[PDB]
Amino acid sequence: GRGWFDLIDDWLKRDRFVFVGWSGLLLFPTSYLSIGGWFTGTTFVTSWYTHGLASSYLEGCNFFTAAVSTPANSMGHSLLLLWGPEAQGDFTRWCQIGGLWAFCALHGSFALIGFCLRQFEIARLVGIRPYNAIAFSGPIAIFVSVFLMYPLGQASWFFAPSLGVAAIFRFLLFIQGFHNFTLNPFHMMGVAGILGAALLCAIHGATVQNTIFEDGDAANTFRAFTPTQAEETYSMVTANRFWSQIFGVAFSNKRWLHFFMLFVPLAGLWTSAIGIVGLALNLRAYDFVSQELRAAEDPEFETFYTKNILLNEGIRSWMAAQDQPHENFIFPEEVLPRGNAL
Amino acid sequence: SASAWERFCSWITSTDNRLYIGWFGVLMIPTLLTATTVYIIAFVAAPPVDIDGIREPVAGSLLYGNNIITGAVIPSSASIGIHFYPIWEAASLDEWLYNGGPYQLIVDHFLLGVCGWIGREWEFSYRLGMRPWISVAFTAPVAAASAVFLVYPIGQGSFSDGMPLGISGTFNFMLVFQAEHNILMHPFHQLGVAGVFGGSLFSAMHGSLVTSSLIRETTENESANYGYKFGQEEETYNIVAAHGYFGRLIFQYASFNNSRALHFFLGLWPVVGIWFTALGVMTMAFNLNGFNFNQSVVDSQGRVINTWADILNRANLGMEVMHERNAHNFPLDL
Amino acid sequence: GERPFSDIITSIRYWIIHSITIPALYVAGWLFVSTGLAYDIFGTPRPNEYFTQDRQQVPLVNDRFSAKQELEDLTKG
C-alpha cells in the first residue's frame, strides 16, 4: 500500500502522549544527552586540570557551586571530540580536559534546533501560525551568541560560560569587569526588553484577572470559564478605560496587545545578542573618551562612570590570578588597585 | 443644589476627567510633579555633590560634564546620613546643593507619589466597578524602589547608600551591593531573577500562543490586528487551538485549560518574584547577606581547593577594595 | 491508546520487578561512588590527590595535542 516513508511519517506524527514528529529524531537524543552530560559533569567530573577548581558533587560542591566547566585555554576552539586528537578515545582524559562542556554545548545547540523544528512541525500539523518558533528564536540567539559566538571570538572555549550557577555568576562579574557590559547600550536594550516583558506579563495578568465578567455565583471565579465558550471572559472596554484614565494610554486592540507581549522580550534578547556578539571581538562600549580625558586633565573631576571604571579595574586585577590560572598571573600586593592605595 | 464640598468631591472622583485624579491623586499629582521638576532641573544643571562626605564632590549633571548615561542625581552626603535634610535645614541653598539635598527631596516625593499611584489604581478600579488587585501587582516595583531608595539607606544608616538617580550610578549601586552583600548568591535575588526571566518567558509564550491562534477575520492586504474590533463580544483567538498546540508541545497538562487561571499565573509569577527580590534587598539592608560558600572544599591535608564561589569571591574582593576611595580608615567595613 | 495510571499502579508485575530492580540500581550507584570507581572512571581526584609531593601547584594543561601525555604525567603516582 503506502511507501515506507509514508508509514514512518504516519508513525512519527501519531497523536500520542509525547509527540515525536520528524523533529523528534534530532531533538530527543540531543536534549537527552545535553541534560545527561550536564548531570554527569555536575555530579562526577572535576575542573581541576582546566580551571584548578572543584565543580562536582564528588569533590564536595553543592547545587550552586557545581558546574560543567569550560575546556582548558590550551585547547583553543577545538571541537573536543572523544575520538579527537586531544583525548584520542580516552574517556577519562576527555573528561579531564573539559570535553564534556563541548559535548553539552554542541548537543544543546542541536537540541535547540530540534525544539524549534518541533514548534514548527506541531504548528503546521495543528494548523496555527508559527509565532512560537519565532519567539523561541530569541533564546536560540542568546545561546548561540553567548555560548558559541563569544568564545569563538575570544582566545578559546575557556572564556565561555560554564554550565553552573556560581559559574554563571562568575561569568556575569567577569564580563562586567573585563568588558563593562552594563555600559553597553545593546545590553541596556536587552534589560529594557526583559523588564518590560515582566512588566507586561504582570500587568496583563492583573488586568485580565481584575476585569473579568461575573460569569458565576461563586466568589472564587476560576470555575466560571469554559475553553469552548464564544464570548470574552474579561472586559476590554473597562480595562481600556481604566488604563486610559490611570496611565494616559491603553491598549484597545487585543491582538496588538499580545503581539507586543511577544515582541518586547524577543527584541530585548536579540539586541542583547548583538551586544554579546560585539563583545566577542572586544569591540565594546567600555569607555567614554571625553570623560576619561576630562578625568585625566582634572583630578577633581569624578562621575559614577569613573568609579565604575575603577571597579572594573579592581575586578580584573583581583580576579585574573585565580580566574585564568593558565596565564600564571603573579600580581604583587603593590600593583593591585586598592581604594586606600590612592 | 449640593454643597460646595460635595461638588468638589464629585469633580475629584469624576470618571469624566481625561486623567483620573481621585483622593490618592490629590496626594500623588503634586508630589510626582515636584519630584519630576526637581529631577529634571537637577539632572540638567546641579553642582557636584560630596556624596562620601570627604570633601571630594562627584559631578552628576549634564552641565558639569555628563551625558545621559553618566548623568545622575547624586545621593546625599554621608555627613548627613539619614538625617532629614530639606532646603530649610541648610544654611544656604548652595550648601543644600553641595550635600545632596535634592536626592532626599526627589526620593521622598517619588515614594509618596508611587504610594499615591497604588492608591489611585485602587480608586479607579473602584469607580469603574472592577476588581481592585492591579494595585497589589504594582506594589512589587514600588517595593523594589523603596528597598533601593529608603530601606537600604535606613539599614546602612546613610542616604548616600541609596541607588543614585541615574544609569551609571545605578550600575555603581549594583556593583557595590554585590561587593558588600553578594546579592547574586542570595536566594531571594535568585527568585527575582527567576521572576523576571519567567515573566519574559511567559509573556513571550502567551503572546505567541495568542498570535498563533488568531481567528481569520481580515484580508491578505491589511494587518491582522484589525480582525479584532474594540468592544466586540466574541473572542478574537481560538483558545482551544493554542491549548492543543501547547499540550502537544510539552505534555497534555503542561498547559492551562482555564484562561482565568492562566492569567492569574501570568500576574502571579513576576509579582511574587519582584516581591521576593525587593524583600531580599530589604533584608540585606540589615546585613543578612546571601549564601557564603567560600573555602567550602578542602583536600585531605586541608588545603583550600577553590570553587566557582571562590572566583566570585575574588571578583567581590576586587570590587570591595576599590569602592568608596579614601572613605575607609579602618580595616573592617562594619 | 494510552495506558491509564490506575492500570499502571495496580499491576502486580509492575511492583515486583521494580522492587527487584530499582534498589539494585540504588546500591549500584552507592558502590560506584564508595568503591572509588567514579574517581577512576571520570578522572576526578581523590581528596588526597589534588596535590602531589613534586607538584604543589595547579596542574594546568598547556598544550593541545599532547594533552593526554601531559595528563598521564600529572596523574601518575
Binding site: 500520542r16 509525547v18 555530579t43 | 578542602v298 | 495506558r3 552507592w30 560506584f32
Partner: peptide
C-alpha cells in the same frame, strides 16, 4: 513497550543511579 516507556526509562534508570551516587557522596568524610 511503547515510546513513552522508553522515554520514561531514559530519565529513570540514570536518575536512580545518580540519586544513589549522591546519597553515597553525602557520607564521604570531608
Amino acid at each position: 513497550f511503547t515510546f513513552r516507556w522508553l522515554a520514561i526509562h531514559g530519565l529513570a534508570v540514570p536518575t536512580v543511579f545518580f540519586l544513589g551516587a549522591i546519597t553515597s557522596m553525602q557520607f564521604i568524610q570531608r
